[PDB]
């Protein structure tokens, strides 16, 4: 009831012999589950929480230098010595200047000089880490039944929200009037948070790769430094200039926030302002529809007239939604909603709001359905005052088949081998495909780690040409396939 208006909506149809389905919930998407004699349900991964993160490293973006001091040694006499050179909060450099009689030395040549200035971090950015045990995904399950009575219900929200954690593998949600739904979620495999850091800069946070973050060329402190002054690679944030071999000065390099933003061009912005909330990534769950039953299946069809209070609106997925008010008596009753052909011989459209019912006369009901391509007629109610609303879909079965193939391909590109677990019932074909995809994805990630989309496209074009120019038709086909997949992935990558 909340995923009609979402562009990234997927319909998981059917269950297994055990009455379970495997669905992968992405943050920006929703899943509508439909099974025979089962209520339609909407599932949305609405939150990921990283709890009690531990600071791993601290990086300096804006620094300042103070207390600059210098010491000089006459040529051939060794190296100059500064007392501040023994303090690690002072950054130092040794260089050689021209020395002679004019500036007070006995002989002519290069004399050693050392410049030390105190290094202070004005602004820093922390990279934090969360253990997989401390993730708390939130999922909203809504019975996909059209009841716009938010005020009418005691709770106020028709959707029921369950918090998934690694501690318990089974989560049970009781949808009042529908039985209960069981979710076997896998927070462990959603995102590897052992290999990731939660990098928060000034008032903005990102989700970055751990090795990338530990290879950042900035002054850093360890996560437990606790004095805040012993920065490690301070030389990355200062410049030592000895332009004419006459004098040496040290200046600081300017705020590096803004260059950090350029560095973060492939990251996902997360939010740490009021808690470490992540709105990216997926969660693979197993949906057990064993104690899930329709609602009001013991009611009798309404013997009254329905008034349309909101005209049939097509959703972005080809399903039509319409709101109908009930005017007749016998308030609690089933809504005789059917999708027919012109002659009303065949019922050729399926209802997505299975078993629509009017709980109260005064309150309207939202009904969604998936009409067929072409002309179809929505008949609502019994014949005295019967509503017969026509509709045209404007698609083709071949067209939506191509669209579904593209949706599945994009899911494979985004989710990887996890795409084989979306709306999947345990089968030989799915398991074999997932194993093959695991092997291929491991090899591909090894071969294409760290390269950008333009590099991916160049490599794919090169591989395609190499394969097309090979005398063996087997190796040629293999290389062309690899190159075409690389080109697709490079085009689909980023964001």
């Amino acid at each position, epitope marked *: 009831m909340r995923c009609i208006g979402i562009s990234n909506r997927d319909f998981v149809e059917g269950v297994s012999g055990g009455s379970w389905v495997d669905i992968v919930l992405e943050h920006g998407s929703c899943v509508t589950t439909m099974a025979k004699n089962k209520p339609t349900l909407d599932f949305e991964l609405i939150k990921t929480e990283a*709890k*009690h993160p*531990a*600071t791993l490293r601290k990086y300096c973006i804006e620094a300042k230098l103070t207390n600059t001091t210098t010491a000089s040694r006459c040529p051939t006499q060794g190296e100059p010595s500064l007392n501040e050179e023994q303090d690690k909060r002072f950054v130092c450099k040794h260089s050689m200047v021209d020395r002679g009689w004019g500036n007070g030395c006995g002989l002519f040549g290069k004399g050693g000089i050392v410049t030390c200035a105190m290094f202070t971090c004005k602004k820093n950015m922390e990279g934090k880490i969360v253990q997989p045990e401390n993730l708390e995904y939130t999922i909203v399950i809504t019975p996909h039944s059209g009841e716009e009575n938010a005020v009418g219900q005691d709770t106020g929200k028709h959707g029921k929200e369950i918090k998934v954690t690694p501690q318990s593998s089974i989560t049970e949600a009781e949808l009042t009037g529908y039985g209960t739904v069981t979710m076997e979620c896998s927070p462990r495999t959603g995102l590897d948070f052992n290999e990731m850091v939660l990098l928060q800069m000034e008032n903005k946070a990102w989700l970055v790769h751990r090795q990338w973050f530990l290879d950042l060329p900035l002054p850093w402190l360890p*996560g*437990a430094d*606790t004095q805040g002054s012993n920065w490690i690679q301070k030389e990355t944030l200062v410049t030592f200039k000895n332009p004419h071999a006459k004098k040496q000065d040290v200046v600081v390099l300017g705020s590096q926030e803004g260059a950090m933003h350029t560095a973060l061009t492939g990251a996902t912005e997360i939010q740490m302002s009021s808690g470490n909330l992540l709105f990216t990534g997926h969660l693979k769950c197993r949906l057990r529809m064993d104690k899930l039953q329709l609602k009001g299946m013991s009611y009798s069809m309404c013997t009254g007239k329905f008034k349309v209070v909101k005209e049939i609106a097509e959703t972005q997925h080809g399903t039509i939604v319409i709101r109908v008010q009930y005017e007749g008596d016998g308030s609690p009753c089933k809504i005789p909603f059917e999708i027919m052909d012109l002659e009303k011989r065949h019922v050729l459209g399926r209802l997505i709001t299975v078993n629509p019912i009017v709980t109260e006369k005064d309150s309207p009901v939202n009904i969604e359905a998936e009409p067929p391509f072409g002309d179809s007629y929505i008949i609502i109610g019994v014949e005295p005052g019967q509503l017969k609303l026509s509709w045209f879909k404007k698609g083709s079965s071949i067209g939506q088949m191509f669209e579904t193939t593209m949706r599945g391909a994009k899911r494979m590109a985004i989710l990887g081998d996890t795409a084989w677990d979306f709306g999947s019932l345990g089968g030989v074909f799915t398991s074999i495909g997932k194993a093959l995809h695991q092997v291929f994805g491991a090899i591909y990630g090894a071969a294409f780690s760290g390269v950008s989309w333009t590099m991916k496209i160049l490599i794919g074009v090169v591989i395609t040409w190499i394969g097309m120019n090979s005398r063996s038709t087997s190796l040629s086909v293999s290389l062309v396939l690899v190159g075409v997949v690389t080109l697709y992935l490079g085009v689909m990558v980023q964001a």
Partner: antibody
Amino acid sequence: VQLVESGAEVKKPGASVKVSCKASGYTFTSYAMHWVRQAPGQRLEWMGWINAGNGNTKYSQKFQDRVTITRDTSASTAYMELSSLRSEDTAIYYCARDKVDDYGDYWFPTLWYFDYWGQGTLVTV
Amino acid sequence: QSALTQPASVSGSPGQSITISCTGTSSDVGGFNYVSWFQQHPGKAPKLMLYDVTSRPSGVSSRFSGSKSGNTASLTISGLQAEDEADYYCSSHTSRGTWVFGGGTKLTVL
């Protein structure tokens, strides 16, 4: 396992008071002997530990230059010596134990540290 | 590596459940499981009630439970009998190899 200390001592400010804890009922050499003070009406305060196995020590920074901890393996007694006493040192001094590792090194504690204490020693000034 | 923070006083009617909080830092309480709770009756040496965050000694009642979340470790008493009225001190083995004791809290029970 019982830890017994010396009797309460009264010292004029600027003096040095040495307290002792006698470890019975267990191998003295296999345990590290901690010293914890508590000002009357204040919280507990860790001072340091003596590794009776080999005499190694570690003092709290607040007592590094004043507190001295020594052991007598044969006597199975630990000693707490706090020189240059001041008004603020009036407090009951406790002794708590902690087993050292299989090799007597004692750098990681045991999760059940300070399991057995002494009745404490009162020092006033 | 400074003194842990605890409420000065805590009270709870007999039979209620009472919770004490010990807040440390990334090295005192949020870094290591060396969180031990000590019960000290007036004029007596402290008694180790809990250790390893949750574990309790052999002779310690089962009404004492410990939890640790982030930099804060909590001690909860369920039965809250009159014999539970005492000063409760929290400790932790810091990352520098030293011991830090919380300020301590007092249970009034009645």
